[PDB]
Design a protein around this ligand. Structure first.
Ligand SMILES: CO[C@H]1O[C@H](CO)[C@@H](O)[C@H](O)[C@H]1NC(C)=O
Ligand SMILES: [Ca+2]
Length: 128
């Protein structure tokens, strides 16, 4: 049940997993938890999510706790600012080092604890 959008296939899971178990599942299917690199991709993702919470490829990297994409897409702090829910990321309990799609809006992302289980979204490139 992979959905096709702009050169990539996407898997919206039916089973919830911790952030890392999710990523491992994605990697087992030749994919990664999804990156988000445009307004149109964000829109495709939150709309397809239909108001449910899905882990995406957001996770912390380096000593500074900068956000990064697990698929190694460079994280663009400037261009991604409009994608977080107002007030996020907020590192609640100093233990929110992974990110999910939460609100059905362009401002969709929340940081949550990595060990919480949620549905998840894998992204796999199509290579002709
Ligand atoms: C009450 O905390 C929840 O909502 C806040 C924003 O109010 C979020 O910042 C926070 O991450 C989220 N917690 C979880 C576990 O998802
Ligand atoms: Ca948060």
């Amino acid at each position: 049940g992979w959905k096709y959008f702009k050169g990539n296939f996407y898997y919206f899971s039916l089973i919830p997993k911790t952030w890392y178990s999710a990523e491992q599942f994605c990697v087992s299917r030749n994919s990664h938890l999804t990156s988000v690199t445009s307004e149109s991709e964000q829109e495709f993702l939150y709309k397809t999510a239909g108001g449910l919470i899905y882990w995406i490829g957001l996770t912390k990297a380096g000593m500074e706790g900068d956000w990064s994409w697990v698929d190694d897409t460079p994280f663009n702090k400037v261009q991604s600012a409009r994608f977080w829910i107002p007030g996020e990321p907020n590192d609640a309990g100093n233990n929110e080092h992974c990110g999910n799609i939460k609100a059905p809006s362009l401002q969709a992302w929340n940081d949550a604890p990595c060990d919480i289980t949620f549905l998840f979204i894998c992204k796999r490139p199509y290579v002709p």
